[PDB]
Design a binder for this molecule. Structure first.
Ligand SMILES: NC(=O)C1=CN([C@@H]2O[C@H](COP(=O)(O)OP(=O)(O)OC[C@H]3O[C@@H](n4cnc5c(N)ncnc54)[C@H](OP(=O)(O)O)[C@@H]3O)[C@@H](O)[C@H]2O)C=CC1
Lengths: 217, 145, 1001, 71, 96, 49, 48
């Protein structure tokens, strides 16, 4: 909770993760600009839910103390939006956050909960413009996995058929386009049907809650 | 809301009202909404209707006036139309972005016609009356065609 | 019907009683001056007591200034206000630091069914003969009558009656001894005999009636009483019990089922009239036939303010709510009666069953809650009740179960047996037989009387008596002593039904004989000719008083003292807002409804009706004609045809997309940059455009020429950037808009200009033209017969002003839409004042343009008065205007300036309820549209022109606040207009005296 | 609890600002006459005068409040 | 229903209000629509309602007391509604 | 920032409308400097301002 | 209508609830106090 709070404050102030000490408070960081102060509360009321009684005055070393009791190992709501918009504007084409998790695990040896923190260190040090090359993305991610290790303290043949199975997968679409057959009509009828199942459960479990399970059964 | 009530109470208190003469606070943005260019003019057309008629209209959404606003004993907050026998002067206070505040005050027109003389007033009355009839004819014709 | 309606954010508490007594007293002030209310009225006595219930130290100082300032010489009503007023200043100083009091004043009425000779039935509530009080209603209820045989200064002087209000009545002739021996009263409490039945007890009922007498003389107090009451709709007992709870200081939850704006403006009007000092009022929406709302409301009452609840307790619970069942018999007992068994019985048991689990948790066993069950005397005795009888009978079992179960400490039952209350939704269907049922000796009660009889069950004599044993109040006028109540019911009806027909069909025949013996045309000259009104829309210039009457207002030394060249004067004014012009806005503002001359202007504004001259279907016509169907509409019928649609589409409402160029608030278009991952399909393009794609994308895009057609073929390769549209559901859904159909074409603006100019200038040209119409200027060149050309200013700017022509330049060039080539011209703030000088006025005065960004128009008056007093202008336009568009609305939303709209639906607010200044739960403003100008002028030249002088702008100022880092934060910079020095306040300055300034002059 | 209508544990655990005793049914009435028995004698020069500690608790009092600023 | 008091009145007592009261009314309400169709008005059906003497007097009955009390209203409604020819009520008050 | 950089959905400030007015360049002269309460009448002339 | 009241006089007893629990608590306690006394004099009898 200290690792997530330090990033989301440093984003809203648009400063580095070292230029803000956590011994200070939210009020002494802004300057007086009360538009920013409501933005700091709203990003943290969404992310953790449990908001303390004096957030704006208490130092940030004491607020990660409070947030730790009700936060463990999640991504969240506010944090998952800032890290997908990070890839959708600063990372190259075909390089999604799925590729940004395959790279941190295979080369650097980082499981799922660790590399959720590597992306948070990469959020406050985001590039000024889009990375152009495919390897310059990997040079960016190698550079941030060691700036994450300075916070935590941890030292660190099938491609011959993927370019083949691309060809069979792209040949399959052009035959299906030729036959004018819809390969997704199964799923669209499926996905618009779990809506009506869950809607009936919303209606049906309303009546076992109103009338009771003894009455209805 | 807190600032406007506070400013009005402070000026009235400093100048020496009587205790027990609160200014009645009309609100117009309940019905039209707040424009930002047109804001002070809609308050300015409203004042010259409250002056001539003597009707004090009412904020018809003030379901509950705020509890903080009781410490301003020199204001009042109505919620219904209150037709009086004479409004002598109306205040018009507009606060803007960029710390642009400002007030006006609008006296009744019958205080102009005390500095006038009876030759002048009678002569003026006839001219205005002729203009009033003529203007009326013009407005109806244009409206219709 | 079982579907839930309660929520925690849909409560409305009412707590500003410290201001509805300064309002209600000043509302009584002018209704005595102008002659609305006179000395006879008992409502002024009723309005006296609702101010004596709310007496603070600040309120008498309000009253003392308004009575000491009125001048008795001018009128006879001016003497009247000071007589009542000093009598009520007398009374409030004694009831100060005294708990408030419920005392119903008004005349107790009776029934009257009168049948006209034409055969029409009419029920009229008539003031009774010998019962003119509630102190006389008490002595009637203690006498009984004939059938129970087994064992003031008011209408003649308000000011004397107003004097008798603080004084408590001192008696000794006890009304317990006024009861005749071997005669049951009409209002008797009961007692369970050890045989097991409930029989009439003398001493229990005598303790009820004696305290009920003191409730009429002195009155009840309910301070610190916490009450639940459901089923409190308009025109029922629960609304008249509510008025007696709020008047005495109770703290009351009231739950409504049809939650609206109409309902919440009614519950505001109740608290703005009756709610005493310290009382409070909550309206929550509700369902009582829902199990999950009786659970969720009793939680929300006892739960603490830290978690959103009330933190209250409860000392009375009154579950009155019922639905109508009629025509429903035992074979037609169905789901409607089965939904209503649950409202009236087996969710009343879950209100009494769930307040005990709220007192079990909190350990509260020394504060009972008196339950007040409404019972009935007729269990099966009427016809098809449905299951009304079954529900009522079940409630009677509770009296025994208080002795036998474990909830005797948290709840105490107090069953009331309410008699004939007529008017309420159960027993209002038969008022025509109520007069005949009283012929026996049975008594019927109006609603303020069974308000009075149920509020005698909360007095501290009977509140203590409930806490020993259960209390059964039988409040029938002897309606259990009539044999065959059903047979006598249909007997009285079938007489009054037949007499209503047999006197009708006989009178219809002797009028058919009369037109046969004497014919039709002999009596055709005996009918009359009526007249329907036409609409005569006036300009409403100020009514001028004679010169004798005028100088009685102004001081006498002002004549010749005061230079009229340097007095500024508003000569005209006009505007365009969400309610049309300045005339149809005042009818909605002052009155809340349109006139006949306002339904005609609001239909001519929005283009509904439309003047036709010539021939309609051969015959000539001149009048208003629907512009849709070209078929005639009379001014008597402009209302009922169009009052619905004008109130639908005018004012603050949902944002309508046709007005704002396809802008849907729910679907706000945005483009996101993607990268292509493989190459796209070749699309064919022209020569110049495909050379533009190549200079952009460089080595990524691929252009090749097609040999026959001569137009190129463009292929994208892997690594190019696309912009795919997405759409964002946006929150801000509501804005106050110029009414739907406001065309600038209907005022006379050509298509040469509308197609060329910005929409905000169409708001201005209509507001400048109409402002000379209010000024008597019919030709704008009449200003030059008196003034020079280079002495007519135009000082009138906007806040943003041209938002529609900034997205022509930042957003519609980038999209490469067909845009004008001179959009930058039409986007400035000083170009809406160019078309006022290009299409109108042709003057050469100052054109100093203001910008204030929300205060553009008071600044504009300031620049105006400063311009005229130096003689640079002798006339100048002043005003301000602004346009509403998509992008400005989104950007006020990110600043948290305008209010969210989906938060407001969650509170149950309606669009005509979301702009609320000075409110406890205000949340932001409501961004609107339109213009408004004024034409100011010297006061010297306004007399020489002959123009309507509407005002005197004595002052105009602007002021800047202080150091900060926040621009939208307001400040007190304009507090420096009251700046004067108070070092020497000893002796009067001669300079402020006016006779001194006259002598110097 | 049984004689004065407050629990001393709730006073120590979460320190209240005000505490209104309520005088409800039979138990409440029983509790109130325990407040009505607060008279102290001093055998005045051969007399006996009792002054009630709680002033306003009479036979009509439905409550009584203990007040404090902090707790 | 036993051990069930006013704060524990729940769906078990609400299922049983319907057995003992408001479906007894639909037996007496549906034999009359079978004699309405067939025109039978010279052959009544004596209804025998089981009543109780103890309406609230025992402890936690649940809603047994409420159901029984409601049945007593039928005696009056035989005089006042339109089903006096098809049904005749005969309320028995069974003791211990 | 408001007509073109929201539509592109770039990262923009949340108070750009504040900083776009013509009477807000004279706000930072009173917020960072002079702390006075005199008139703040703002002109627009579009070439003759 | 016919109302048959078939109680043996069970509407003439005052406080039917109080007299119900009075008869039970005597017969419950006598069922225990005659049980736990007899279980001890058999535990004494196997000690002496
Ligand atoms: N009036 C009489 O003659 C007598 C009446 N009684 C009883 O006294 C009470 C008096 O009511 P009265 O005011 O006369 O009748 P009304 O029908 O006027 O009032 C009952 C209120 O219940 C509310 N309500 C209706 N349906 C529901 C529901 N499903 N859920 C929640 N609330 C609902 C209604 O107003 P809204 O939804 O707006 O709140 C309604 O006004 C009734 O219970 C009646 O049985 C007893 C003896 C005599």
């Amino acid at each position: 909770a200290s690792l997530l709070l330090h990033v989301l404050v440093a984003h809203k102030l648009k400063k580095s993760l070292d230029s803000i000490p956590m011994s200070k408070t939210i009020k002494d960081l802004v300057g007086g600009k009360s538009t920013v102060q409501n933005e700091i509360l709203g990003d943290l009321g969404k992310e953790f839910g449990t908001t303390p009684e004096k957030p704006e005055e208490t130092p940030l070393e004491e607020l990660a103390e409070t947030f730790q009791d009700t936060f463990s190992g999640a991504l969240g709501k506010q944090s998952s939006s800032l890290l997908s918009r990070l890839i959708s504007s600063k990372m190259p084409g075909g390089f999604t956050i799925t590729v940004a998790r395959k790279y941190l695990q295979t080369r650097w040896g980082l499981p799922s909960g660790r590399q959720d923190g590597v992306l948070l260190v990469a959020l406050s040090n985001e590039p000024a413009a889009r990375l152009g090359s495919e390897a310059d993305a990997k040079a960016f991610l190698d550079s941030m996995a060691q700036k994450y290790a300075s916070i935590v303290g941890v030292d660190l043949l099938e491609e011959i058929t993927k370019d083949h199975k691309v060809l069979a997968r792209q040949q399959l679409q052009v035959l299906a386009r030729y036959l004018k057959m819809d390969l997704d009509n199964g799923e669209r009828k499926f996905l618009k049907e779990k809506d009506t199942v869950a809607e009936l459960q919303a209606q049906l479990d309303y009546l076992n809650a109103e009338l009771g399970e003894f009455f209805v059964n | 809301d807190k600032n406007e009530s506070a400013t009005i109470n402070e000026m009235m208190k400093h100048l020496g009202r009587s205790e027990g003469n609160p200014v009645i606070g009309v609100f117009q943005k309940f019905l039209t909404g707040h424009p930002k260019g047109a804001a002070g003019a809609w308050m300015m057309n409203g004042a010259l209707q409250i002056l001539n008629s003597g009707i004090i209209p009412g904020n018809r959404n003030a379901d509950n006036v705020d509890k903080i606003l009781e410490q301003f004993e020199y204001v009042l907050y109505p919620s219904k139309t209150l037709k009086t026998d004479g409004v002598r002067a109306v205040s018009i206070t507009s606060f803007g972005f960029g710390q642009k505040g400002g007030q006006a005050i609008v006296v009744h027109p019958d205080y102009l016609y005390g500095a006038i003389t009876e030759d002048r007033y009678n002569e003026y009355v006839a001219k205005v009356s002729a203009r009033e009839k003529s203007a009326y004819k013009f407005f109806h014709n244009g409206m219709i065609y | 019907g079982v579907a839930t309606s309660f929520s925690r954010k849909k409560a409305r508490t009412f707590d500003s009683s410290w201001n509805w007594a300064k309002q209600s007293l000043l509302s009584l002030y002018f209704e005595i001056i102008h002659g609305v209310l006179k000395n006879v009225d008992r409502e002024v006595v009723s309005e006296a007591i609702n101010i004596m219930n709310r007496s603070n130290d600040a309120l008498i100082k309000f009253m003392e200034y308004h009575i000491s300032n009125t001048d008795e010489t001018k009128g006879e009503n001016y003497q009247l206000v000071k007589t009542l007023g000093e009598q009520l200043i007398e009374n409030c100083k004694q009831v100060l630091d005294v708990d408030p009091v419920y005392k119903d004043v008004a005349k107790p009425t009776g029934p009257k069914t009168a049948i006209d000779k034409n055969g029409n039935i009419t029920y009229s509530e008539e003031p009774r003969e010998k019962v003119r009080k509630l102190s006389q209603y008490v002595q009637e209820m203690a006498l009984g009558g004939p059938i129970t045989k087994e064992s003031d200064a008011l209408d003649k002087d308000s000011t004397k009656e107003v004097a008798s209000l603080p004084n408590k009545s001192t008696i000794s002739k006890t009304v317990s001894s006024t009861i005749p021996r071997e005669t049951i009263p009409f209002l008797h409490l009961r007692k369970k005999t050890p045989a097991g039945d409930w029989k009439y007890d003398r001493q229990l009922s005598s303790l009820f009636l004696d305290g009920l007498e003191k409730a009429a003389f002195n009155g009840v107090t309910f301070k610190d009483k916490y009450v639940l009451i459901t089923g409190a709709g308009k025109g029922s007992i629960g609304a008249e019990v509510l008025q007696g709870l709020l008047q005495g200081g109770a703290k009351v939850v009231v739950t409504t089922s049809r939650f609206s704006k109409q309902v919440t403006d009614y519950y505001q009007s109740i608290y703005a009239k009756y709610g005493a000092k310290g009382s409070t009022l909550i309206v929550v929406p509700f369902n009582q036939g829902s199990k999950q709302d009786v659970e969720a409301l009793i939680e929300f009452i006892y739960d603490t303010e830290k978690n959103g609840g009330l933190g209250w307790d409860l000392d009375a619970i009154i579950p009155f709510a019922a639905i109508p069942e009629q025509g429903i018999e035992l074979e037609h007992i169905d789901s409607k009666s089965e939904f209503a068994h649950r409202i009236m019985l087996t969710n009343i048991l879950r209100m009494m069953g769930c307040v005990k689990k709220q007192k079990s948790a909190r350990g509260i066993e020394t504060r009972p809650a008196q339950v007040i069950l409404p019972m009935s005397p007729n269990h099966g005795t009427f016809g098809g009740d449905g299951m009304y009888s079954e529900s009522k009978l079940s409630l009677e079992t509770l009296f025994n179960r208080w002795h036998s179960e474990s909830w005797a400490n948290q709840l105490t039952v107090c069953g009331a047996i309410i008699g004939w209350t007529r008017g309420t939704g159960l027993m209002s269907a038969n008022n025509i037989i109520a007069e005949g049922i009283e012929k026996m000796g049975v008594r019927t009660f109006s609603q303020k009387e069974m308000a009075f009889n149920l509020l005698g069950l909360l007095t501290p004599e009977v509140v203590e008596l409930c806490q020993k044993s259960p209390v059964m109040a039988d409040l029938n006028g002897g309606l259990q002593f009539v044999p065959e109540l059903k047979e006598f019911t249909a007997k009285l009806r079938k007489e009054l039904v037949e007499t209503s027909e047999v006197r009708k069909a006989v009178s219809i025949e002797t009028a058919l004989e009369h037109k046969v013996v004497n014919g039709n045309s002999a009596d055709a000259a005996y009918a009359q000719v009526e007249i329907q009104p036409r609409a005569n829309i006036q300009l409403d210039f100020p009514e001028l008083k004679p010169y004798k009457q005028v100088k009685q207002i102004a001081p006498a030394e002002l004549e010749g003292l005061l230079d009229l060249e340097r007095v500024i004067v508003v000569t005209g004014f006009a505007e365009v807002g969400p309610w049309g012009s300045a005339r149809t806005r005042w009818e909605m503002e002052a009155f809340g409804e349109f006139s006949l001359e306002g339904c005609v202007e609001m239909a001519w504004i929005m283009g509904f009706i439309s003047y036709h001259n010539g021939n309609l279907k051969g015959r000539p016509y001149t009048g208003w004609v629907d512009s849709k169907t070209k078929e005639p509409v009379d001014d008597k019928d402009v209302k009922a045809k169009y009052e619905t649609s004008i109130l639908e589409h005018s004012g603050i409402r949902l944002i309508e997309p046709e007005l704002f160029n396809g802008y849907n608030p729910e679907k706000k278009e945005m483009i996101q940059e993607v990268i292509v991952e493989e190459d796209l399909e070749p699309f064919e393009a022209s020569k110049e455009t495909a050379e533009q794609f190549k200079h952009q994308h460089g080595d990524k895009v691929d252009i090749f020429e097609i040999p026959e057609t001569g137009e190129y073929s463009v292929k994208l390769l892997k690594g190019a950037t696309l912009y795919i549209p997405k759409a964002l559901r946006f929150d801000r859904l509501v804005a106050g808009q110029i009414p739907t159909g406001w065309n600038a074409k209907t005022y006379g603006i050509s298509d040469d200009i509308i197609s060329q100019v910005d929409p905000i200038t169409l708001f201005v040209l209509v507001s400048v033209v109409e402002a000379f119409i209010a000024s008597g200027i019919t030709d704008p060149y009449e200003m030059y017969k008196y003034v020079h050309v280079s002495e007519v200013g135009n000082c009138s700017g906007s806040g943003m002003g041209g938002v529609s022509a900034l997205r022509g330049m930042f957003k519609d060039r980038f999209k490469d839409e067909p845009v004008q080539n001179d959009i930058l011209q039409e986007s400035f703030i000083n170009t809406m004042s160019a078309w006022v000088n290009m299409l109108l006025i042709s003057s050469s005065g100052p054109i100093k343009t203001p910008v204030g960004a929300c205060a553009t128009s008071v600044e504009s008056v300031d620049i105006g008065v400063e311009t005229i007093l130096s003689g640079k202008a002798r006339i100048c336009i002043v005003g301000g205007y602004d346009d509403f568009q998509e992008e400005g609305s989104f950007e006020f939303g990110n600043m948290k300036a305008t209010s969210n709209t989906l938060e407001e639906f969650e509170h149950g607010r309606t669009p005509a309820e979301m702009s609320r200044p000075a409110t406890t739960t205000r949340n932001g403003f409501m961004e609107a549209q339109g213009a408004g100008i004024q034409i100011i002028m010297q006061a010297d030249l306004a007399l020489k022109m002959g123009v309507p002088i509407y005002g005197i702008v004595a002052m105009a100022a602007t002021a800047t606040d202080k150091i900060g880092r926040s621009v939208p934060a307001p400040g007190k910079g304009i507090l420096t207009t009251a700046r004067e020095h108070h070092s020497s306040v000893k002796y009067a300055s001669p300079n402020l005296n006016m006779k001194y300034r006259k002598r110097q002059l | 609890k049984d004689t004065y209508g407050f629990s001393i544990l709730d006073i120590v655990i979460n320190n209240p600002v005000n505490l209104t005793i309520h005088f409800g049914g039979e138990k409440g009435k029983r509790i109130r006459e325990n407040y009505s028995a607060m008279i102290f004698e001093t055998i005045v020069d051969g007399k006996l005068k009792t002054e009630k500690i709680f002033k306003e608790i009479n036979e009509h009092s439905t409550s009584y409040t203990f007040r404090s600023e902090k707790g």
